[PDB]
């Protein structure tokens, strides 16, 4: 259905995330390449997108979404379904610390319902 | 408190509208200069801004808020309080027709609580 992690701009946010296909989970990562954790989080998300082609995976440089966003709120991951926020992970502690492995983020997104298999 | 109609970009939407000062009414006009009605609506909204300095009045070119936005949804006026949408006016018919005078926008914005003399 999907399968790959996608880069989007600020003005594509509403279309891709808030108005995403009905009943689809969207996982948007709000990021800055300047932050090592963001670089890492995207690594796992690229991989997780392929493993869960049913879930939508997008990412965006916060500067083109929300101006003057603070480093201490990064990384930011929001989980959406039907234009509603199902989960928020804001900052290092919530996104699961500076060391964060593939399977830990997988789990993180799982207990909240964002990704499933069959 | 405010007093003038102000131009914002897409990435200033979240800060200026969704996260606007608690209890403040925000009137955002999503527009394009190519559409006469929009030109006319900004005229009224500039004047109204000054008359109701308690209400926040902003305007923004949709192309930098939502990409691929359809002419037929213009003009778009959203009314916000505390990050929640109180009223939506989308397209010519709802923004009160091609002839639309200062006082009938005022009334329309007033009927739903956006502007006030106290
Ligand atoms: Na489900
Ligand atoms: Na009130």
Swiss-Prot record, chains A, B:
Residues 1-115 form the Phosducin domain. Testis-specific. Residues 2-118 are annotated as: Thioredoxin fold. It is found in: Endoplasmic reticulum. Belongs to the phosducin family. Interacts with the CCT chaperonin complex and actin. Essential for male fertility, spermiogenesis and acrosome formation. This is Phosducin-like protein 2.
